Amino acid sequence: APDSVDYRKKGYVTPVKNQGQCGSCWAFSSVGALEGQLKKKTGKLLNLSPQNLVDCVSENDGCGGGYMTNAFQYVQKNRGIDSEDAYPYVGQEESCMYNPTGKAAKCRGYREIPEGNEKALKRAVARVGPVSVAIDASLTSFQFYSKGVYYDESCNSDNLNHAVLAVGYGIQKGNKHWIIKNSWGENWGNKGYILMARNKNNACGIANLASFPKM
Numbered sequence: 316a317p318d319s320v321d322y323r324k325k326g327y328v329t330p331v332k333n334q335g336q337c338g339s340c341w342a343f344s345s346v347g348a349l350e351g352q353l354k355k356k357t358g359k360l361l362n363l364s365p366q367n368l369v370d371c372v373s374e375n376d377g378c379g380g381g382y383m384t385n386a387f388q389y390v391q392k393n394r395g396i397d398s399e400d401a402y403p404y405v406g407q408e409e410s411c412m413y414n415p416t417g418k419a420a421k422c423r424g425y426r427e428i429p430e431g432n433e434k435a436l437k438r439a440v441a442r443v444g445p446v447s448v449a450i451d452a453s454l455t456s457f458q459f460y461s462k463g464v465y466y467d468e469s470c471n472s473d474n475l476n477h478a479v480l481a482v483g484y485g486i487q488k489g490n491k492h493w494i495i496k497n498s499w500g501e502n503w504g505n506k507g508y509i510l511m512a513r514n515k516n517n518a519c520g521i522a523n524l525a526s527f528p529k530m
């Protein structure tokens with residue numbers, strides 16, 4: 316595998332979004348991974364609808380939270396997901412209003428990275444594209460991230476409370492990292508991104524709930 320990978324450089328990653336008050340991080344993570352595969356498969360980058368997921372993935376809890384795998388399984392069984400333009404984000408759960416006419420992507424299933432395996436996660440990012448991951452994002456130190464490679468010994472890998480997108484990996488000044496796209500707006504972090512410690516005993520649980528869609 317390459318020493319570093321950054322899918323932003325290749326137009327596989329849409330702008331950083333802001334989930335607002337809704338607990339829809341799982342939907343932004345899912346859409347990010349789907350977006351990556353859509354660009355890879357069709358050459359077109361577009362915003363897909365996290366609202367479609369919030370409203371229509373019955374296995375998840377809308378703004379109460381959710382699993383990205385349930386989201387990929389929905390898109391698969393539904394035979395599509397709408398674009399953001401066709402099904403805009405409103406930041407509160409509403410009735411499912413999926414419209415096949417606005418369909419922008421399909422899913423043929425998903426793959427999960429073995430729990431805890433950062434080497435497998437690295438391989439997946441290198442081979443497939445951006446990968447949905449879950450982390451402990453609860454710490455104040457995480458809130459206040461500005462630059463460098465984030466590591467906090469207090470991060471709890473058993474408390475996966477937030478879903479984000481691994482769009483690459485690399486090394487900065489000797490510190491191996493994951494390139495993580497968050498959904499807290501471009502004002503948070505470093506332009507909406509965080510570099511998170513890689514190969515540091517699965518810091519923040521980065522490799523405990525990772526998955527990507529098939530297309």
Ligand SMILES: *C(#N)C1([N]C(=O)[C]2[C][C][C][C][C]2C(=O)N2[C][C]N(C3=[C][C]=C(F)[C]=[C]3)[C][C]2)[C][C]1
Nearest residue numbers: 338339340341374375376380381449476477478
């Ligand atoms: C974001 N924003 C939020 N976080 C999550 O959704 C995280 C993402 C990583 C996995 C765990 C998930 C989560 O908080 N939940 C899992 C699914 N839950 C659920 C509840 C009821 C139901 F019928 C089905 C699923 C809720 C908890 C912060 C919200």
